[PDB]
Design a binder for this molecule. Structure first.
Ligand SMILES: CC(C)[C@@H](NC(=O)[C@H](CS)NC(=O)CCC[C@H](N)C(=O)O)C(=O)O
Ligand SMILES: [Fe+2]
Length: 329
């Protein structure tokens, strides 16, 4: 029936160091994975993912309907016209199973010039009451900078893999303006499971979320130990095995654009599984005005005829497009 994808485990610890040859050997493994299925697991990453999962569970399982309305994005609460990205994405009992909480750069405050200018895709995070969820905000903001650090190191690997100096991507990935987001997704156990929340793929597979390419430069994902992801290959969809100690990494469609599809954005989908689990992506986005001149690693000169694409315009279009194709999450 369904084969299993080759997803290598890459020790990324050299990318935090100064052994340049060891970093090249990591870059080679990133290149090979990016040209095969497009996924790899980053191991020896140094992030306490046990505390991540525990604090996230405590939040999902203790927030009340009252608090969810207070935090809801505008899709679920007409009063919150300024919350398009950041806030709570409600489940709909009997109809929609998944629920999530999304937050952005903690440096996006009312004092931030992008917030003053009302620039699209920039928002101030909303948080639950500290007394009802003690330590949650402190944990979540710290985690943002923890995975920001991991992501910066990974971008050095991708740069070296493509033959560029190690700051080629990372120089556009800055704490003061990154549009990167964390999403804390709960997939619940439900009995009976609402049929409306299950989609049937063309090939008969039951899905929670249909095929898509990620709107990101790269995606840095922690999931609990329940198998669910599939990646499309020419020979059909292949199962991605779960590993709840590592981060699963793949390219988004901005990487595909700027490399002239040398590193494709892998198409993937989420199988339906009736099990309580967590999916915690960090979407590595650059700044609103970040532009990287596209290039083609296949050509000696590296010349490409693709237009440079501003990351802000890419992100605004891509988020809307994904909602329109696969539905409001
Ligand atoms: C496949 C996983 C990453 C996860 N899916 C997802 O997170 C899906 C597909 S990548 N992503 C989205 O809907 C885009 C969220 C963007 C976010 N609100 C923002 O403003 O930045 C899942 O488990 O459903
Ligand atoms: Fe995805």
């Amino acid at each position: 029936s369904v084969s299993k994808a080759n997803v290598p485990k890459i020790d990324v610890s050299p990318l935090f160091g100064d052994d340049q040859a060891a970093k090249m050997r990591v870059a080679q493994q990133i290149d090979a994975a990016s040209r095969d299925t497009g996924f790899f697991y980053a191991v020896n990453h140094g992030i306490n993912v046990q505390r991540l999962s525990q604090k996230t569970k405590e939040f999902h399982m203790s927030i009340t309907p009252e608090e969810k309305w207070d935090l809801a994005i505008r899709a679920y609460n007409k009063e919150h016209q300024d919350q398009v990205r950041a806030g709570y994405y409600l489940s709909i009992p009997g109809k929609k199973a998944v629920e999530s909480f999304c937050y952005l750069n903690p440096n996006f405050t009312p004092d931030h010039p992008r917030i003053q200018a009302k620039t699209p895709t920039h928002e101030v995070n909303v948080w639950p009451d500290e007394t009802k969820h003690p330590g949650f905000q402190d944990f979540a903001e710290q985690y943002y900078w923890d995975v920001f650090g991991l992501s910066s190191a990974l971008l050095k690997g991708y740069a070296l893999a493509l033959g560029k100096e190690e700051n080629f991507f990372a120089r556009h990935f800055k704490p003061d303006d990154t549009l990167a987001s964390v999403v804390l997704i709960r997939y619940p156990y439900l009995d009976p499971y609402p049929e409306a929340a299950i989609k049937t793929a063309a090939d008969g597979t039951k899905l929670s979320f249909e095929w898509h390419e990620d709107v990101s430069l790269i995606t840095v994902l922690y999931q609990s130990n329940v198998q669910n992801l599939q990646v499309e290959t020419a020979a059909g969809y292949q199962d991605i095995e779960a590993d709840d100690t590592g981060y699963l990494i793949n390219c988004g469609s901005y990487m595909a654009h700027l490399t002239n599809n040398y590193y494709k954005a892998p198409i993937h989908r989420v199988k339906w599984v009736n099990a309580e689990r967590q999916s915690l992506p960090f979407f590595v986005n650059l700044g609103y005005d970040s532009v990287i001149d596209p290039f083609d690693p296949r050509e000696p000169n590296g010349k490409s005829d693709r237009e440079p694409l501003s990351y802000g315009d890419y992100l605004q279009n891509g988020l809307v497009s994904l909602i329109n194709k696969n539905g409001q999450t």
